[PDB]
C-alpha cells in the first residue's frame with residue numbers, strides 16, 4: 044500500500060485481513076467476511092474502469108440491418124462487449140501479485 | 151454450527167422509500183350510436199384530456215365499443231380489474247368515477263375490522279406470565 | 288417556545304437508542320398505535336388527498352420503546368419526533384343491506400351503505416436529537 | 421382486411437425482427453407510463469427504457485438487449501447491499517450473509533419488484549409486440565450473464581459424488597450468492613421447472629438493467645438512491661435465516677473464545693411438569709450475566725432454545741438501524757469517516 | 771350577561787305545555803346549547819324546565835361558528851407534499867411541496883400549456899444523444 | 909356547393925358566407941373528433957383506437 048500503509052489499518056485488523064480460515068481451526072479470526080466485501084469493491088472498480096476507458100472499437104453489424112439507438116451514455120456500457128472485468132480480475136494474475144509483494148511469507 | 155435457510159425472501163412495503171400508483175391502465179370504451187354514451191363522449195372531449203395529463207403513470211386506451219354501454223375498466227398492479235358501467239352519466243359523474251379507479255387498488259372490497267395492519271413484531275413483546283412479578287391467587 | 292424538561296432531555300437519547308419504537312398518533316382525536324412501515328385504514332374518506340400525498344402527523348400521546356415511554360400531557364411536543372405518512376389510496380367495503388321491519392307489517396325498508404376508507408402508510412417514525420434544544 | 425385495418429402501423433418486416441425498433445418506443449403508452457410510474461429522471465429517454473425490457477433470449481445482438489445494462493446494475497445492487505449488511509450486522513456468519521444478499525438482490529425478490537412496477541410479459545418476442553412489454557423466450561436457457569465467479573475443477577464430482585465444498589472458497593470461486601458457476605418451435609406444451617427459472621431470470625435482469633440505465637444517464641448517486649428506495653426498503657427478518665446444529669456446543673465455544681465464564685443453564689421458571697404441555701423457562705448464564713433465554717415444553721429443548729437465542733443475540737448485534745456506509749464518502753462534502761466494527765468471524769465448533 | 775342554556779334531559783313523556791317552553795327557548799335536541807339575555811321573560815321560561823336543562827351565566831354570546839369550534843378536535847396531520855392533480859374548474863395543478871414554503875395551476879387548450887411532458891418533449895429528449903453525465907458524477 | 913335556403917336566411921354578413929363555404933361537415937365519429945384535438949393526441953400515455 045505504499046509508504047504509510049502499515050498505519051492504515053488497525054493492529055488487530057492487520058492480522059485479521061491476513062489470516063485464512065484454515066489457520067488454527069479459526070480460533071483466531073479469519074478474513075472470509077472482509078474478502079466478500081473486497082470482491083464487491085474490486086468488481087465495481089474494475090467495471091468502472093472499462094466504462095470510463097477512453098477506447099472505442101468497431102461496432103457490431105446487425106444481421107437484420109437495424110441501427111442501434113446510438114446514445115452516448117449507452118456507448119460507455121457498450122464497451123463491455125469487447126472487454127469483460129473477468130479478463131482483468133484473473134485468479135492467476137491477482138494471485139501472482141501477492142507472491143511478488145511477499146504475501147506468501149506473512150500470510 | 152449455523153446453516154443458512156434459503157427459502158425466505160424480503161417483502162415490499164409500497165410507500166416506504168418509494169411509492170407506486172396501483173392503477174396502471176384505464177380502458178375507456180364509448181359508443182357513437184348508443185344513447186347511454188352521450189355523457190361518456192363528452193367526458194372524452196372535455197375532461198379526459200386534462201385528467202390524463204395529470205396522471206402520466208396511468209395508460210389510457212380509448213377504443214369504441216358499439217352496441218354496448220360505456221365502461222371504465224381499470225387494470226391494477228396486483229393483476230385484477232375493476233369495470234364501472236357509466237351509462238346515462240354526465241361527464242362530471244364520469245370523472246368522479248375515474249378518480250375512484252385511480253385512488254383504488256385491485257383488492258376485493260372488505261368490511262372495516264381493524265384500522266392498523268402491521269407485519270413487524272411488537273416493540274414491547276407479547277405478554278407472558280413467566281416474565282412479570284408473578285401472580286398470587 | 289416552552290423549553291423541554293431536563294428529565295426528558297436526559298432520557299430521550301436512551302429512548303431513541305433502543306431497537307424498536309412505537310407511537311400513538313391521533314387523527315381527528317382518534318388514536319392509532321402504529322410503527323414505521325405499518326398501514327392504517329381510516330374509517331372515513333379524508334377529503335383533499337390523492338394517492339401519493341405526504342402527511343406530517345403532529346399529535347402523538349405516547350412515543351415509547353420496550354422499556355421507556357414518553358408521555359405528553361395533552362400530546363407530545365412536535366420537536367421531539369418526526370412522523371410522516373403517505374396516502375396509499377381509497378378502499379371500499381361491500382354493499383350491505385339493512386332491512387328495517389316490524390312484525391305484522393309487510394313494508395320492508397332497505398338501507399344501502401357502501402363507505403369509503405382512506406389508507407395511509409407510515410413511512411417515517413424517528414426521535415429527534417434534543418442536545419441542541 | 422378492409423373492415424379490420426391494423427391498429428398500429430408496422431412494416432411487413434416487423435414480425436421478422438427479434439425486437440421492436442427503437443423509434444417504436446416513442447409511440448408506446450405502456451413505456452411512457454412505466455417511465456413515470458418509477459419517477460425516472462427525464463435524462464433517461466424512452467428508447468433506453470425500452471432496451472431494458474429486451475432479454476438476450478429475445479435479441480441475441482450485444483445491443484438491443486439487457487446483457488450489458490443488467491451486468492452494470494447487478495454490480496451496483498450487489499455492492500450497495502453487501503456494504504449495507506456488513507455495517508448493520510457486522511457479525512453475520514458467511515452463510516447467513518449469502519442468504520441475506522440472495523434475499524434482497526436475488527431472482528426471487530427482483531421478480532417481486534418487477535411485478536410491483538406493473539411490467540407484463542410478451543407471449544413470444546418479436547418486432548410486432550408492444551415495446552412496453554418484457555420480451556424473453558423461456559425455451560432457450562443458453563443465455564447467461566457474466567459474473568465474477570469461476571468454474572470449480574471438481575464441479576462434476578460436487579454434484580455426483582457429493583464432494584465437500586467449503587465456505588471460505590465461495591468468496592473467490594462461486595457467484596455473489598455462493599452458488600456454483602455453470603451449475604420449428606412448437607408451443608403445444610405446458611410450463612416446466614426450467615421455464616419458470618428462465619422467466620424468473622428475465623424479470624431479474626430487467627430490474628438490474630433499469631439500475632444500469634440510471635447509472636449511465638443520471639450517475640452514481642442516482643443509482644444508489646434507486647437501489648436504496650426499491651430494494652433496501654424491503655423488510656427481511658434475518659433471525660429467521662438461522663438454522664443451528666448443536667447450538668449448545670457453539671455457545672460453549674463462543675464463551676471460551678471471548679474468555680467468558682463457561683455457560684450454565686438455569687431454570688428461571690417452570691409450570692406443568694408432569695403434564696402434556698409444560699413450560700420450562702431456561703436461561704443460560706456466564707457467571708452472573710444472562711446471555712439468552714428460551715421457553716419450551718421440554719428441559720432439553722428449552723436448553724437448546726436458550727442457547728440458540730444466545731447465539732442470535734451475538735450474531736445479530738447492530739450498531740444502529742441506519743448506519744453510515746463507506747459509500748457515503750464518495751459523495752463530496754461528507755463528514756470524516758469513523759472506523760467501523762470488524763468482527764473476527766463465526767465460531768467453529770465440534 | 772347571558773344565560774347559557776343546555777338541554778340535559780328529554781321531554782318525551784312530559785306534558786305538551788313543556789314541549790312549548792322548550793320550543794320557545796330553541797331547544798330541539800339533547801345537549802343543544804342556546805344563549806338568551808338575563809331577563810325575567812327568559813328566567814320564568816327556565817323555571818318551567820329546570821328539571822331538564824343546565825344553566826350558566828356568561829358575559830357574552832357565542833356565535834354558531836364559535837360554539838361549534840370548542841368541540842372540534844385537532845386534525846393531527848398536515849399535507850406537506852401534494853402530487854400533480856386536475857381540478858375540473860381551474861385546471862391542472864402542478865406538484866407542490868409545502869415543506870419548502872407554490873401551487874401553480876396551468877390551464878389551456880393545448881398540451882404544452884398544461885405544463886406536462888408531451889410526445890414532442892420525449893422526441894427532443896431522445897435526439898439529445900450527446901449529453902453525458904460528468905465523469906466525476908459517474 | 910349547394911347552400912340551403914335556411915343557411916342563406918341565416919347568413920347576414922360576409923363572414924357568415926365564408927364560414928358556410930369553408931367549414932367542412934363536422935365529423936360524426938368521436939375518433940375523428942379526437943384526432944383533431946390538441947391534447948389527447950399529444951399525451952404520451954394516451955392511445956386512441
Ligand SMILES: [Mg+2]
Nearest residue numbers: 781782783784
Ligand atoms: Mg307520540
